[PDB]
């Protein structure tokens, strides 16, 4: 009906699949752009059975992108780091088509316009800033989403629940606060804000009060849930910093991000601005899965671990 | 004709594919065991077009393995680290069938019975030793292959030829010697020795005199080949050792191996034993691609990088 038509790039991705499912769950006509050679064949079939329209092609196909843009209203990009500046191909098509009502570039992490990181990570988020500056320069309607930490991803990474080991690695002192959100919710809320007038040309941050914690607190709560105690092994901050300078790329990128997230506490090191919008306060009919609920999920039916591409 | 029939486990793997191709090139009837859900569909079609017989199944299918064992003469395992002890399923089937003429377990690296490493790596090669002990206890005919370093893999890992950076990382002093061999050759030679009476119940080491070098010498030669100088950044040994103790698994495994190969120089830290067989001395009609030739290949048509499973 009146539902805005949504085009998602990187829909088969780690976080992208949750945006595709959330879009369909909310009854939005959904277009998924995917490479002809993608190995996400079975995932694409699932999307198709849920009602999505699959469009195979390459970002280099300018004409195809323009013709596709003319058929939709909202464009969301969930592409990976290696393709951040490739989003300029998406942006060029949006500019030519001229009918797009909202563009959400691939952020879904830290709020890059208010935080700085070590060189390895700073270079990547500087690219995301370049995208933002171009959007604003062209007066393209947007929404910048800071989803903070992907919860299943980091519960898997930090707690290694699928590992029977007796020790646990802590980065830095482990006292830095951070916020983490369940991927399924990140996906749903992203679709909601992409069409909410309250998020037009604004930064939206996902920071529900029930999802703020520190590494030590997460370990403690997990220990209580499963009835086991771990020996905590800390990796000194100076140690982490040194590695970012000596290790090659892309090996040093994760290290620099670990420093930014769990040592500097970038997802919780700032206060909200006047124009900022915190997503959990937007829909009284929805809520973010809490940390206790998340841990329960890992006790009853834990999701597989993942590793971002660099 | 009268060629021995070869069954390869993990044939679709990084080194495994080179063994399958080498087996077919040498005219051996070749059986490839692969999981029903493998994503190596296009590689499998290639094997098939080359003459290989594909057999889909799981290692847990004891009866299937036994009936398969009965149809072949030689069994080679190129499975990954996570499945080392899973090789006991292959061994049980071999014991029951009773007709196998030679079994080559998944080693193709350092000579585990004469070297020791840091805990992260020591645990993995200890498993490989367990397999070797069971083979000998059961009087199963074997050949243990120490292929040393996979060259394309490590030229990519150490030189990052696909990276236009001005710096290069050196592990330790960079003075430790190591031997590396081209994957295509490792595969060919493995098939040759699997049927050479000279390799029956012996350790075979791939160490051609033209393929021995240090990190610094490798960097130097690469610099001359491409006409560019790099800034060398060293990672102290004590630094590498500390990481193996603080970083969680699997992350700490590669670090421990880097120490073993490029700091301890495990592939060149020993002299040959009386019963050792150095493969390059075996066939006057063949030879290992040299380091110079390997570098030339990376200048004209470099192979993509890779990452072992942990
Ligand atoms: N906040 C956090 O904790 C967190 C965690 C992870 C990631 N992130 C962020 O979330 C965003 C997406 O990350 P992700 O892990 O979801 O991405 P991903 O799964 O690695 O990749 C997303 C999609 O990119 C497409 N793609 C891959 N290579 C491509 C290429 N060469 N050219 C064109 N398309 C290509 C693929 O789709 P097809 O195969 O269909 O073409 C893939 O499904 C990024 O901005 C990332 O930084 C944040
Ligand atoms: N010397 C060196 O520099 C070096 C470098 C790398 C590796 N290595 C060694 O070479 C050997 C093989 O390494 P690799 O990297 O070639 O192996 P790989 O490519 O990681 O895997 C080999 C094969 O295992 C099968 N497999 C994967 N997961 C499985 C599971 N859960 N159950 C059963 N089968 C599974 C897959 O075949 P299907 O999909 O067909 O089932 C896969 O192609 C190892 O012993 C390794 O340590 C040495
Ligand atoms: C440290 C292990 O995870 C990562 O390397 C990257 C994928 C994680 C990530 C990527 C981009 C981000 O903005 C972010 O902040 C929440 C987190
Ligand atoms: C350092 C990056 O590579 C590795 O972590 C492992 C795959 C490399 C390897 C695995 C097993 C080995 O025996 C070996 O010695 C030559 C090398």
Residue numbers in the entry:
A (entry chain A), B (entry chain B): 5 to 314
What does the primary publication say about this deposited structure?
The co-crystal structure of EGS complexed with a specifically designed inhibitor, EMDF ((7S,8S)-ethyl (7,8-methylene)-dihydroferulate) provides a view of the substrate-binding mode within the active site of EGS. However, EMDF cannot serve as a substrate of EGS because within the C1 substituent, a cyclopropyl group replaces of the C7-C8 double bond and the orientation of the ester is reversed. A key interaction between EMDF and EGS is the packing of the inhibitor's phenyl ring parallel to the A-face of the cofactor's nicotinamide ring (interplanar separation 3.4 Å). The para-hydroxy group of the inhibitor's guaiacol moiety hydrogen bonds with the backbone amide-nitrogen of Val114 and also interacts via a bridging water molecule with the side-chain amino group of Lys132. The inhibitor's C1 substituent bearing the cyclopropyl and ethyl-ester moieties projects into a cavity formed by the C-terminal domain of the protein. In contrast, the cyclopropyl group of EMDF induces a distinct kink in the conformation of the side group, which steers the end of the side group into a hole formed within the capping region. The stringent binding selectivity of EGS is further emphasized by the observation that only the 7-(S),8-(S) stereoisomer of EMDF complexed with EGS; the 7-(R),8-(R) isomer (present at low levels in the EMDF preparation) was excluded, due to poorer steric complementarity with the EGS active site. Although the binding of EMDF exploits shape features of the EGS active site that are inaccessible to the coniferyl acetate substrate, the structure of the EGS-NADP+-EMDF complex nevertheless provides a useful framework for probing the EGS enzymatic mechanism. The structure of the EGS-NADP+-EMDF complex shows that the ε-amino group of Lys132 forms interactions with both the nicotinamide-ribose of NADP(H), and potentially, the substrate molecule. The Lys132 interaction with the substrate is particularly intriguing, as it is not proximal to the site of hydride addition (as suggested in the case of IFR), but instead involves the p-hydroxyl group via a bridging water molecule.
